[PDB]
């Protein structure tokens, strides 16, 4: 581990310092189908005509990123993405830009979102949830070691691959920060109290978010929900959680620690670091080595029927790609 991460820091640092740019053109890909949508872009199943491969291309409208004041965050995204390398993070294959947008051609993860299966299935058994937790545990342990904060953990951002393993996408709020940070970021249901409480924060928010994840997986719903975010924030900062009667005692106690308002008492943030979690009773059966190697029995395998099969994703209206005769936000994005 410490040795592993040690070697790991070095490749990221090289990449951090000399981030890559413009590794392709639009016309080398064949646009096939929107897999997801968002405030200022859509992810598309795309086909590389020279290789006959499929990727997920993220298309960011430059003007809309500017209107929404998301330039830095967008920059962090591409820079951190091309620099990292772990078995549970999606691979950035290319990036380029045109007069009108920014592109990130990532690897097409066929299994669909975790969100989708969990919604349909209802709730996951502890063992099935634990399979997935362990994978975010290591991923955070890697991420944090590089002074990165993930900041957007939710079922919608975790994808399942052919082998029933996790692939974390969306690094739109990922930030390399040594010391506290202040942006109100994320999804309401997953915000740590410190964040809603405008009090500057660190990595500890990633362990509270994980505490929420495990809860939504095992019980089928978030520990704090209401109809409007203000009502949710209120619940989050109250520090009052009710646990489903079907939660094991070990799970109830992992969750009490992970969802600790007092961040000088919150697991992951303590003296012994990430070991407090990796050594918790709930996890006693987990073989972290076997899991990092992808040699564990995957509890569920979404099966798909061939390349380009997009039946694990919901349908979205197709908006048409428009690329201006005039370069749009040159200076703002020159480092992209």
């Amino acid at each position: 581990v410490k040795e592993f991460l040690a070697k790991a820091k070095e490749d990221f640092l090289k990449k951090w310092e000399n981030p890559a740019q413009n590794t392709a053109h639009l016309d080398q890909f064949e646009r096939i189908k929107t897999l997801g949508t968002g405030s200022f872009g859509r992810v598309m199943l795309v086909k590389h005509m020279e290789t006959g491969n499929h990727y997920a291309m993220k298309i960011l409208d430059k003007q809309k990123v500017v209107k929404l004041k998301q330039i830095e965050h967008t920059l962090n995204e591409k820079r951190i993405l091309q620099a990292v390398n772990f078995p549970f993070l999606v691979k950035l294959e290319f990036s380029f830009k045109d007069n009108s947008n920014l592109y990130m051609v990532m690897e097409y993860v066929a299994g669909g979102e975790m969100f989708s299966h969990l919604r349909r299935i209802g709730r996951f058994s502890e063992p099935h949830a634990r399979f997935y937790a362990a994978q975010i545990v290591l991923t955070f342990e890697y991420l944090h070691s590089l002074d990165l904060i993930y900041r957007d953990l939710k079922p919608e951002n975790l994808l399942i691959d052919q082998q029933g393993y996790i692939q974390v996408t969306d690094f739109g709020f990922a930030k390399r920060v040594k010391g506290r940070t202040w942006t109100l970021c994320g999804t309401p249901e997953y915000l740590a109290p410190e964040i809603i409480l405008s009090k500057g924060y660190n990595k500890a928010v990633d362990w509270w978010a994980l505490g929420v994840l495990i809860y939504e997986m095992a019980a089928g719903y978030p520990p704090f929900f209401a109809d409007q975010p203000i009502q949710i924030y209120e619940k989050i900062v109250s520090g009052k959680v009710r646990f489903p009667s079907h939660f094991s005692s070990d799970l109830k106690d992992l969750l009490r620690n992970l969802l600790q308002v007092d961040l000088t008492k919150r697991f992951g943030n303590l003296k012994d670091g990430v070991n407090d979690i990796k050594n918790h009773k709930w996890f006693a059966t987990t073989d972290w080595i076997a899991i990092y190697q992808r040699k564990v029995e995957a509890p569920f395998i979404p099966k798909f029927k061939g390349p380009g099969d997009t039946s694990n994703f919901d349908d979205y209206e197709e908006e048409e790609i428009r690329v201006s005769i005039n370069e749009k936000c040159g200076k703002e994005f020159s480092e992209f």
Partner: peptide, 20 residues
Amino acid sequence: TTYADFIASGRTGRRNAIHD
């Protein structure tokens, strides 16, 4: 039930990220 209470609610679908 909390499950019932959850399905009847407004945030059962894909949750969006809070920017500004």
